[PDB]
Amino acid sequence: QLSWKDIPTVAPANDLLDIVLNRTQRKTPTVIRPGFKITRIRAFYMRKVKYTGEGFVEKFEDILKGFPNINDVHPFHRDLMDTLYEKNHYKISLAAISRAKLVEQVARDYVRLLKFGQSLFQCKQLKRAALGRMATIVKKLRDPLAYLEQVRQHIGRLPSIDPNTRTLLICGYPNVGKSSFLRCITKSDVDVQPYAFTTKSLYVGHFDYKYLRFQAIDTPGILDRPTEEMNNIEMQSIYAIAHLRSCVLYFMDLSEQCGFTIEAQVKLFHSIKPLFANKSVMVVINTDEERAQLLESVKEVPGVEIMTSSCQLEENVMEVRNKACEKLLASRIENKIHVAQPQARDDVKRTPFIPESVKNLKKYDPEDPNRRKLARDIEAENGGAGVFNVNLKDKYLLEDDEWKNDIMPEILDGKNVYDFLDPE
Amino acid sequence: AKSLRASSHLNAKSVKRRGVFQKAVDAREQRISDKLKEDLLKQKLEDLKK
Amino acid sequence: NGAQGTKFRISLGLPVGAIMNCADNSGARNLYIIAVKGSGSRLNRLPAASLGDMVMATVKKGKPELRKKVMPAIVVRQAKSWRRRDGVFLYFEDNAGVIANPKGEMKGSAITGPVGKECADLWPRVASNSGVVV
Amino acid sequence: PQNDYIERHIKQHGKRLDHEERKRKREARESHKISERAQKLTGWKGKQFAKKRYAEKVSMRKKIKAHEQSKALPTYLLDRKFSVPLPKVRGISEEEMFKVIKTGKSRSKSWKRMITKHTFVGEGFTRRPVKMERIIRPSALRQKKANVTHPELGVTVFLPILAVKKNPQSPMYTQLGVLTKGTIIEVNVSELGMVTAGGKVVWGKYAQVTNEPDRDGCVNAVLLV
Amino acid sequence: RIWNELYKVIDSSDVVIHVLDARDPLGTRCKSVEEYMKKETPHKHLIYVLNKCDLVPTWVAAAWVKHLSKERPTLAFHASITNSFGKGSLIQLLRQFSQLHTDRKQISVGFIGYPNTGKSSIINTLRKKKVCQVAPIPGETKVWQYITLMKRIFLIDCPGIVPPSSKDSEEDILFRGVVRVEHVTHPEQYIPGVLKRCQVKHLERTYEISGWKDATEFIEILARKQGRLLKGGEPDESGVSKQILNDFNRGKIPWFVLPP
Amino acid sequence: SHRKYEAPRHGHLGFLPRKRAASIRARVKAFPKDDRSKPVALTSFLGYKAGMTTIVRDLDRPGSKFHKREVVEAVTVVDTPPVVVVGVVGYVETPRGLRSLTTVWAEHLSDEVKRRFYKNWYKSKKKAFTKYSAKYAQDGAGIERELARIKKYASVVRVLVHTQIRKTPLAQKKAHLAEIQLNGGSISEKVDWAREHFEKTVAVDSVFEQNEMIDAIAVTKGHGFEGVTHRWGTKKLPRKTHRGLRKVACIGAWHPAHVMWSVARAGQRGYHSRTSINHKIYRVGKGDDEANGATSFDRTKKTITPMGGFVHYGEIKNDFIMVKGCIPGNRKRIVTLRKSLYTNTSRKALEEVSLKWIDTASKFGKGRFQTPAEKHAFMGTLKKDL
Amino acid sequence: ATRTQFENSNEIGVFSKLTNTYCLVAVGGSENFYSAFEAELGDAIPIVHTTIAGTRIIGRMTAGNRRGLLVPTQTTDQELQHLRNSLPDSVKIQRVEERLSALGNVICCNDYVALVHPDIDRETEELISDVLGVEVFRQTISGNILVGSYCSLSNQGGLVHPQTSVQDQEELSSLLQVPLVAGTVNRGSSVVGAGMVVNDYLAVTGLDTTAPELSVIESIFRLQDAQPESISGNLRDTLIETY
RNA sequence: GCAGUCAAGCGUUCAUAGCGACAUUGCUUUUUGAUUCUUCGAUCGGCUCUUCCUAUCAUACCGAAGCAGAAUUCGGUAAGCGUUGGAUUGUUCACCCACUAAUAGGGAACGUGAGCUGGUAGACCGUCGUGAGACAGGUUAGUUUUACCCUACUGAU
RNA sequence: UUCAUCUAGACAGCCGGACGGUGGCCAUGGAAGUCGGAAUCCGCUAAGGAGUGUGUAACAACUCACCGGCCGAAUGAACUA
């Protein structure tokens, strides 16, 4: 789920080999002598083989568990990562690493052989043999790791999308305006240059409407493309429109701009309307009779709603945003507080007690020159948080103000003043 | 952690010393000299009781 | 973390392997197990702590749904001689135990009997769930 | 996040003020620092540095070579004694083969001998009772399959061993089934689909082991065609 | 240490008997060893012996023997130096295997199975005297031993084994004689398993109580009856549960699994 | 081999050799660095330790959890009667170290310092400084020549002072003598200060004041020949081990041929010379003014000396310094108070300590009353009265 | 309304008690919690640091209305004097002898009614019934008997924790005479009294409490112009898809 | 490891013999991360306490990484300071869960044999032996005891 | 030591040129010398690759390879010890 970023780095084969073997040469001891006991020599080389095995399987386990299971996640993420990374290659590489995690077999076999070593040379050659077979296995992992590091960097940079949240797609032709709609409606770092596939990916933005988080999704582009041939950039848009439970806003841009004709726009709309069968569609015109017939074209679809507006004005934008949110929430609650009251128990009156001071009072503007000092700043003036000694007095209310810096005696000879202290 | 003999912590302390602490350390010296001189003058006054 | 304030020092009464009382009606009666968070590391020394200290524990007596299950929570009474930095030495009738999550939030909703002043000042939700302080 | 955000950031703001000068200066100082690392880096790091540098030299030599160069028998008899590929192998002492094993509380009886090297026992082995067994052939030093190479075809196969016919050391060792260097074994060859004139499938052939498998867990061998 | 002895026993054996408890044979089966014997060692024979057939009715024994004779010979047995069952049948089968292995000069028979199944007792039953140490606690045989009959059949005692199939559970491992219940911490949580497995009629005939609910209440009833209580009035639930779990396995409480 | 379990050392190898100190009065081994910009000032003072007691304070410590809250604390009380100046020493610099080239004494000196110079006072003719007093004749040519020598050379100036043990209740009759450095400027002015201060006293208010962090140098309370367990802090062997259990069993398996300086053996515990720094003065009280133990919050007239006096000490009839916590040395000893050697960058040395109350109850038991008047009032009239 | 945090906690009972005519806060390292109240309030009413038996947990240690202020037995004479000196004579302050010392957990009150733990009576608690203020009621919030923690209150509305039932809500709003609602605080908290302080004109809670929770608080307490508690009529399905 | 390919060089006074660095192929079992994970014959481990090595686990300072921040990975100087508490003897040439900033590796013994503590005489079962007895075993019970000498070390004249 | 360049000017620096068919053909959302596959030709030239690298979404721009101007005499590579 949602930001598979915590994947440790996948080093290439040679670097991984250098790491795991230098760790063995460094951590485990390096000195033994022929005059030592054969048991000591055996334990030495056994420890080396076992540590070398454990390093490789720790590394491989960090790859296998950190990477996601492309099946078993969500169909939307599955299809997205399939069109990005070629699911077959993905699974094949990870299976290669799993079967290499073989190293265990080599370690066990060669340790059990080392139990019968009758000489330093024999034990040394067996150790060398185990580590060399490990090295061969890893040398045969040169390409999958290169693939997987790249997939790691990409899948870390992918955005976190919840498919079940209140969503709205922003669709249209290339070079329409649907991306700087996202720019204007929402915080998002997206490019708006005038050419077709300026964006090659999905971009996400969030906003809050009616005390509810929504997410808008800008999608790079779709072409008319008879659909048994299309690229991995448009299949992102298609899978996003198909999977998610959103509203969807098709931007038409009724104008000679766009480098695209209105006939082609309505053609694409009629091409991709089968995805729209349950998706709460709206059309927005961003500023002759056949061109208008082409609009009742699309109005004749059963569930649709047309709007005219601009990126020139910034209120129609919020207008149409709220329209899309309202269209969604209704059949959300379809697909899916009690305040109590007294009942008249008595006549005793109750009323809010508020002094005139707060009603005569002025709010606090944090960016006015002439304002209240607010002891934060008196602290800043005298000395910081941990040094400023506030006087708990200077606030107190007395008959005489000259006695500010007085003290009350607490104890006399044996007695306590607070016990004897009455007014009378 | 940062050790006692860490250069950065010692530089920060060096910057603090010249300010709010040396003023308090220097005031006490003038106070105590003013007391030291009076403890001489009172002994002279007692010597001049004879 | 989870606690509000500094690591303050009050004497140690509750080493590892100590069964102390739970009096809330979450279901437990007893708390035993190993661990103390913020404990040092010294050869041959026992992990033992208080100061509203958080500890790992199991129900030795209670409901089976929460027996067999390790859980964090906080000392509220000790029965050792503790010193207040304001005067006198304090001590309780007994040890007391009781249950929470790692953020300091309680599985139960009310506490019986007194709870330590410094324990309540250090753990907010204990102060909200406690009706009796000292 | 969300996409190539740093590439966007570099397009919008751009990398630093002091980026290109510093990169140029790093590339310039690398010539000094390479030699600095050579005269320093004592030990394994210097050894590896030298290895890397030698490999890099060879790569560039081959690259320049490729640049500048890119600027009698018939086909069927091309590609073409009965002595085995390993006569006169090192001789093994009985002491180096058999380890002494001692039995009793006060170990005073020895009479038992453990074979230290890899072995082939058979298909129906079924260990002898302890009071009656003298020769011990441990389970870890027991091979069923070898790695047999055909000299022709440049191909190897993991074949099951069928027997041991001749270990050149003391033919007792043949009956024990000791797979020392130079040992001759029968291996199955049904995987290769060999057939004699007449149509009878061959499923057994002689091979000679080329390694000392007491040092390597592998039993590597060469077919005798 | 135990599995080294297992593989040693197998490699030394010509025949392998697999001892099962008639209460739970499929629990006590150990299929991985049979698979190893299939792939590694087809020249061994691998027969089954249902033991403790005196604890279950005759029809359950017949059902299990029918179910298992489809694959492996599967004798039934009861081990006792005085009152036995299946001794002559097993003798006949072993001398059959001997007649087949006429060239070996002797034939070794290993005894494999879970702990507390009756391997040592079967050997003591064949020899008709106490040859191997026996105890109701699981791990009395800790290392192998050769034993002789006919000058031609060598029995081998093996320690008990449990494979680490993690689909298993600590409860399933408890309700097979494997562990010593003295070392487990909360024996009370397992008594629901005892109620699940056993029949209320036998369970009330055994302890002579009656009409309980709530195994927690069952324990306290039994403790008040036995006078098994602490300094005060708390009845010792822990020790009473330990005794119940020892009785369940040792066969003081009758229980059995049905086959298909 | 590699010990299987790391653990820290037992004891500190810097506080060695753990031998008896060569003098009851610990020797000050460093005075603060001189700034010749500032007035003339003593670097140290002498005192006599007199028990301990307990106080309550109102703490204005921002950031802390007793900020604006009350705190009980222990304090040490040193009887600090005025110190008398009797001499001057000049310490010239050399490429071997510091060398004294002349010492000058005063005209008249007390029987106390003469007793310090003597070892059997009741038999002697007490002829100590007769010829020096004679050298103090008409013009004092020698005195002025050596003083001018000190002005010319000698680099740094220390002053020989002694105590007024006569004032304390201690039964010793013999004063201590000590060199105390002058840390102002102008060696000429130092010498002039001393010349004017011969035969005259210096009180402790003229060397210290409240809220000052001082160092105590003293000798620590000999206990005698002690064993490993209590002298270094080692574990004890379980029970009935061979050749005893209060010791180190051995060194391990490995074989040396010697015993090291590092292996925690038996010997003397205590009477070591120690220098403990940064103790905050809480009160500079004076004998002339009673109600020393009283406070702004209390207003209960009483001196700090508890009922029945201190234990193994008498009453405080003299000026005293109160510091917080635990200094080295036991009651009835000689301690030197030095000032801090360095400017301290802690707010602890800035907070103006205010007291609320001081405990003047009996330390010869469980004291419940601060004053005999309180005891009288609580107990009521007895049989003996009337 | 307002959100803010001191040291880093969303629970405001760690620091403060707040009524129409005074605001108590705890003394801390920094004067930022005090400044947060001074910003919205200015010098209009007393804003007072101090501890209760050297403790910061003062909204959970104390309780009062615009007419007065009850503090426990563990309170010292000096802190009591400090409160007396720093507050006007209009607020009567009293130290109570009781077994249950956490008065802000044992009691929930407004200027016209109060609920209490069902436990022990007192002479001057039965006298406070009509002396000091008015009605006391021994009641229980869905079994939670810690009413000042598990229920926030004012003169204009009331909040309870979310496991309270409609029946009990109707039964308790009859006693208080003003509308109640069940809600959560600070990303799903049942403890509302510590997580929030509120009155006739102003609300203060933690940074982590969500916008729907703030909207309910604003509704049920009548903050924004105008929010007479059936603005829930507007924000019906927001709470539906939220919960 | 075995058997090979190639080719920078070396090359009986060889152009078409031989040697051969760096690279590289096959065999090890599989292609879709299902592997239920599955052990197969060794002739020690645990207390007190000191020091040392660095081949650095943590702390300190830096470099490179698609390193946004947060966290992490690789590496350079660095041995100043630390590097735990427990369960398990049907056994541990080890593993398990917790706390922790971290729970790094080793030596000075084991290059025959050296503090303190667990792991011959009697008796029983098993295998063998005609037998006396032995062992493929297993179980049980079962007395070395300095220093007062020199040196070292620690304190004291 | 061997091989090469050099007053018809060497090496290093600066400066300028660095073209034309042509945005060569396949491919693609786009790729024009520079993501990739395969051709890799001719023309005009002093010389200028269907292009050595940086770069652009693509062009652009810069760069080297190669030529020329200024400078005015030695220089470079591979090897051995």
Ligand SMILES: Nc1nc2c(ncn2[C@@H]2O[C@H](COP(=O)(O)OP(=O)(O)OP(=O)(O)O)[C@@H](O)[C@H]2O)c(=O)[nH]1
């Ligand atoms: N008239 C008008 N033109 C607009 C407006 N907003 C954007 N545009 C035009 O849209 C062009 C850029 O296209 P984008 O905003 O990137 O739309 P897009 O290309 O379909 O977005 P992506 O496909 O996601 O990359 C600009 O050249 C603008 O002229 C608008 O509000 N009014």
Ligand SMILES: Nc1nc2c(ncn2[C@@H]2O[C@H](COP(=O)(O)OP(=O)(O)OP(=O)(O)O)[C@@H](O)[C@H]2O)c(=O)[nH]1
């Ligand atoms: N009722 C009944 N009890 C049996 C039978 N066989 C064995 N037992 C009992 O089961 C207990 C434990 O079984 P064991 O005889 O030790 O079997 P085992 O665990 O394989 O024996 P070891 O190899 O020594 O571990 C014994 O104490 C017997 O009392 C049987 O056939 N019937």
Ligand SMILES: [Mg+2]
């Ligand atoms: Mg665009």
Ligand SMILES: [Mg+2]
């Ligand atoms: Mg058993």
